[PDB]
Structures are given as C-alpha cells and as structure tokens.
Amino acid sequence: SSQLHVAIVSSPGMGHLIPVLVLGNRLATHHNIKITILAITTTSSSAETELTNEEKTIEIIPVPSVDISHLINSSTKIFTQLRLLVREALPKIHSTIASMTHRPDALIVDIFCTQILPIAEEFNISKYTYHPTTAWTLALAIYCQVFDKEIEGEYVELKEPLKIPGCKALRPDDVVDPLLDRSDQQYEEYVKLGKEYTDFDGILINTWEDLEPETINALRYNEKLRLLLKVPVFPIGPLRRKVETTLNDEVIQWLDKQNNESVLFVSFGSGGTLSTKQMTELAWGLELSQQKFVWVVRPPSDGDMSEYLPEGFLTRTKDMGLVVPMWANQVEILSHSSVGGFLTHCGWNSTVESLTNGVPMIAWPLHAEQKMNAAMLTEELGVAIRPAVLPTKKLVKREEIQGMVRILMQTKEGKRIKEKAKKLKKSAENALSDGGSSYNSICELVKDIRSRE
C-alpha cells in the first residue's frame, strides 16, 4: 500500500544496465521502493534466456527489441541505431508495462529511451529521465535547439566557442559526437532528445551540486534556460557500483606488493580501443616512463597480446608493469590503496569510479561526451591532465606519453592533482551521506512521485 513501484528502463548493453542497476539500488536503500528494471535487449547466442529478489524488490525483466537491420547501414552512427531500436521497440515496451500485474507508479527512462514518453502518458505514470553524465552535457543537449537556429554552418568549424547561458563556454573541438556533422541522422536525433527532456516530470543527473554548482544553478534559474526546461533537476550523484569480492583477482594480488598510490591504471574498458600505431606508442611511453602500471588491452582497430605490442614488450616490462587482456575489475582496482593514477577515456562512470576513490587521471577522450568530460576534469576541476591535442585529432607519441606518466606519478604537480582528487572524493562522500545534497535530492524526487499519486 505505502510502498512505491518505480520502473527503470535501460537501453541495451552492460554499459547501460549497470548504471540503471546502480540507480535502483540507491532508490531502494533509503525509501521502501520496489524497483523493476525493463532491460531492452537485442539478439545474441543461446543467451536468449530473455538480482531478481526473494521478497520481489529488485526484478530485472528483459524486453526483447525488434530487429532494425532494415533501417540502418554499415555507416549509421551508434546514436542513430540506439534511437531507431528504441523507436521500433516501443510497442513491445507498451506490451511489457501493460501486462505488468503491479503497474509502476513511476517510470524512469535512461537517456536513450526518452521516446517511451507517450507510453507513460497513456498509462498515466509519472515520467523521469536519468541523465548519467555531467549536468554540463545535459545543458548542452537542452539548449542545442537554440544553437540549431542561430548557427548556419557546421559547429566543428566555428572560430569562437558556444555560449550556454550560465555555463562554461564549450570550445568547438570538445563537442559531443552527434554535433560533429550536421548532415548526419544523429545530429537531428540529438536535437530531438534535447527537446524531449523538458516533457518529463523531472531530470535526474548523475552529478552533485558541489561539482557543478554553476551549471546546476543555470539549469534552475537562468532566464534563457528556464524558457526551455520548466521542470526540476535532481543531481543525485556520484552513483556507482560498490566493491565486490571476486575469485582470484590476478591484478589485485599483484597490487598488494606495490607501494601506496604508486601504480598507473590504464584502461579504456569496453568503451573503445586504440589503433595499432597509437597502441604501440602507448606501449613505449609506458615502458619509457620507468613507471609501475597495470594496462588493460583490446586488440587494435585501424579505422595474443604480444603480436600487437612492440616486440618483447612484456619480457622487458616484466619487473615493472602488468598487462591484462580484455577486461578487469575496474571498481576494485581503482579502490586499491596502491593505485595512484588512471588513464581513461573519461566515460562518466569510469570518471566517477576514479573520483570517488581520489585517484587522479590522464584524460584520454574517445567519443560520446568524453571530450567535454575531459575538459571539466582538467580546466574546470584540475583532477587530470590530457594530451596537448585531443588524441582523436592527432596521434599521441611516446615522448609525450612518457612525460604525462612521469608528471602524474612522480612530480609534485602529480601530488597536487591527486590532492584535488582526494578533495573531490570527500565532497562526493558528503553529498551521498545522510543529509547530503544528493541524498536530499533523492528524497526530493520521492516527494515529487508521492505528490502526483
């Protein structure tokens, strides 16, 4: 009777489900909320079998999408594909919710599912969107419908940056992928998402007031912005996975010998991979740095580990570093006391796993909103150092990579950057703890749900 039913909808891919699984976990930590996760999938193996609880409090339901292969081609952007899939899946999602015996009191969609909006309206459910990256990139998405109408040619071409009312100016090189090419599908789909945000009952952003106090304030009170929005923002971050016991973590038992904060963690996760030329440079610059590291490798994309590395790389670096194939327990490593640095694509979940541990960063942006994330982490916050030219524009050579490592790990500049990471970690802990802003922002989102019911 008293307890709420919240349904969170995840677009496909572990990279999208885990944040949604993290968000439901927080809602249910402090507020008597049954979480159902509608998990939009696409097709793979005999994994067509498409933590479901003893008390039925956190259930994952697979929602199998309909096949979009006939609406795409080999040159379609992954933003556009994601949007065409959710668009096409809409009836099956209409069907899932309609046949749920306990219908949800509130529906939260992730950022790639805002087209579910009519379904929530038809069924009369409170609607919300989960923006899982900066409030900055959120304010860009919303305002882009104004930049659309007042800029004539490409954005990538501009001489001066982009004035988001209230907010840091966005230098054209640092723009999100949908905005690289105005002729593309994804550009016109991005401008739409921006106008879809405002139709929800509120927006949740995985950030916290201290980290983005101007942006969040702009969102709430700017003259020019509040024309576009008219709904509240709930900064509830930084949300991310707790540390897990695992079975024989080869990397963790390595790190137990090393000295405190003396290892550089290098991983792009699943986000991405490097080309062969950029891979072998990173191999040298790590080798050259005379610096202890753990490196997660994905065979390269030019458009047995030894093969795609400099010859006898591992044989040489045997004493110094640790090379790891495919994947690692990233939250767990970043939580090791003996880790001091992190070269990362700046995916906002990886960033937040690093910050909440006071690990500073080498910002290596790759796609999506990562450039704009790597801009905040260096200019705005000073918790990271990026390469002089975004590694998407020009190769980053081993000499620069070498000095990057040495600065971060060895010098007093590195110690100050890490000092900033440890302060950010602290103000995140405050924001999450009882009475914090993110804590109260959640208790304020609950208040909104219980009000419309």
Residue numbers in the entry: 3 to 52, 59 to 311, 327 to 476
From the paper:
Five distinct GT protein folds have been identified that are capable of GT activity (termed GT-A to GT-E). NbUGT72AY1 adopts a GT-B fold comprised of two distinct N-terminal and C-terminal Rossmann-like domains (shown in cyan and brown in Fig. 2, respectively) of seven and six parallel β-sheets, respectively linked to α-helices, connected by a linker region and an interdomain cleft.
To gain insight into the mechanism of NbUGT72AY1 catalysis, SI and UDPG glucohydrolase activity, we determined the crystal structure of the monomeric protein (apo) and complexes revealing the structural alterations induced by different ligands such as scopoletin (acceptor), UDP (product), UDP-2-deoxy-2-fluoro-D-glucose (UDP2FG, donor substitute), β-carotene (effector), retinol (effector) and combinations thereof. In addition to the apo-form (I), a protein structure was obtained, which crystallized in β-carotene-containing solution (II), differed from the apo-form, and lacked the electron density for the ligand. All other complexes that vary in their bound ligands have one (III, VI, VII, VIII, and IX) or two (I and II) disordered sequence parts (shown as red sticks in Fig. 2) located between Ile42-Leu59 and Ser309-Asp327. Starting with the apo-enzyme (I), two different conformational changes can occur after substrate binding depending on whether the acceptor (I → III) or donor (I → VII) is the first to interact with the protein. Thus, as the crystal structures indicate, random binding of substrates to the apo-enzyme is possible, but the products are formed only after ordered sequential binding of the substrates.
